[PDB]
């Protein structure tokens, strides 16, 4: 389900951010790739410097491939 996935997204943010309010950019790349999300270079360059859980949840709901 989508709710199932949102809980997976949340727990993964906690893991990849080491329990922090903001995730380092290179760890954000690891986090998104762990869910199959591949950004283009200039999409990466457009990410804001400060990435919190709500940013990641909105991002993951937009980019995740629910077919796979």
Numbering used by the authors: 1 to 68
Sentences from the paper on this structure:
Proliferation and transmission of these obligate endoparasites in their host organisms rely on efficient cell invasion. Actin polymerization occurs between the plasma membrane (PM) and the inner membrane complex (IMC) whereas myosin A is part of the glideosome, which binds the essential light chains ELC and myosin light chain MLC1 (called myosin tail interacting protein, MTIP, in Plasmodium spp.). MLC1 (in P. falciparum: myosin A tail-interacting protein, MTIP) binds at the very C-terminus of MyoA, while ELC is expected to interact with the C-terminus of MyoA upstream of MLC115. We demonstrate that ELCs bind to a conserved binding site on MyoA to induce its α-helical secondary structure and stiffen the MyoA neck.
Based on this finding, we were able to determine the structure of the N-terminal PfELC fragment (amino acids 1–74, PfELC-N) by both X-ray crystallography to 1.5 Å resolution and by NMR spectroscopy. Both EF-hands lack the canonical residues that usually bind calcium in calmodulins28 and in agreement with that, we did not observe any electron density corresponding to a bound ion. PfELC-N crystallized as a dimer covalently linked via disulfide bridge, but both NMR and non-reducing SDS-PAGE indicate that the protein exists as a monomer in solution and the scattering data calculated from a protein monomer structure fit the measured X-ray scattering profile with Χ2 = 1.37. A comparison between the crystal and the NMR structure highlights that the loop of the first EF hand (residues 16–22) and the third helix (residues 40–47) display the highest degree of flexibility, in agreement with the heteronuclear NOE experiment. In general, the assigned backbone resonances in the NMR spectra superimpose for both full-length protein PfELC and the N-terminal domain, proving that the N-terminal domain maintains the same structure as in the full-length context. Contrary to T. gondii TgELCs, the homologous EF hand loop of PfELC (in isolation or in complex) is bent to the other side and does not possess the residues needed for coordination of calcium.
